[PDB]
């Protein structure tokens, strides 16, 4: 079919551990210091801003390596609206 054409050239010319609090995600300095701002889970972690959540007296300028790398694999944003976050179960350790 090249040869017929060469004749014509002169003629055309969800995740499971994302339902799971910060103590059980294979990590330990991203667990104990988030629940003391009434966010016991990843839920309000993604809406709230890391200029104030890190400014609270439990996080700081090294927690962004343990939030933004979480938000790399889980895709959530800064201020995002959650589709269905809370079940009936609420607990702690």
């Amino acid at each position: 079919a090249t040869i017929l054409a060469e004749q014509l050239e002169a003629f055309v010319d969800f995740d499971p551990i994302l339902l799971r609090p910060v103590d059980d995600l294979e990590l330990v300095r991203s667990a104990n210091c988030l629940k003391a701002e009434a966010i016991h889970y990843i839920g309000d972690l993604v809406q709230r801003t890391e200029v104030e959540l890190l400014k609270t007296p439990n996080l700081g300028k090294k927690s962004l390596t343990e939030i933004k790398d979480v938000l790399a694999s889980r895709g959530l944003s800064l201020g995002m609206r959650l589709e269905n976050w809370p079940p009936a179960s609420i607990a702690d350790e």
Partner: protein
């Protein structure tokens, strides 16, 4: 939040970045407290020193990092809290009655 929870998180804070050049003043930024409030509360619970606490284990982890690997001592000073080897060996002789060189030779 009561105060006995914080020192449980304060000892869950420290043992993970000892190979880092870490100090007390970055703990106070992460814990939000001042630089002085860390050192009063450690005596109600441990009755030891928290200023030397982050300095004690840079001997104790160099008591196994030197012991297991083939690392020489003159890089331990620049990272694990000091500037020269003449002060790092002296803190060992107050803690565990030994010199660093004959600490490995004792099988």
């Amino acid at each position: 939040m009561s105060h006995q929870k914080i020192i449980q998180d304060l000892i869950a804070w420290i043992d993970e970045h000892i190979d880092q050049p870490l100090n007390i003043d970055v703990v106070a930024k992460k814990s939000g407290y001042s630089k002085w409030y860390l050192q009063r509360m450690f005596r109600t619970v441990t009755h030891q020193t928290l200023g030397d606490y982050i300095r004690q284990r840079r001997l104790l982890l160099a008591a196994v990092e030197l012991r297991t690997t083939e690392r020489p001592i003159f890089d331990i000073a620049m990272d694990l809290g000091y500037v020269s080897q003449q002060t790092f060996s002296r803190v060992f002789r107050r803690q565990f009655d030994r010199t660093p060189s004959d600490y490995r030779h004792r099988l």
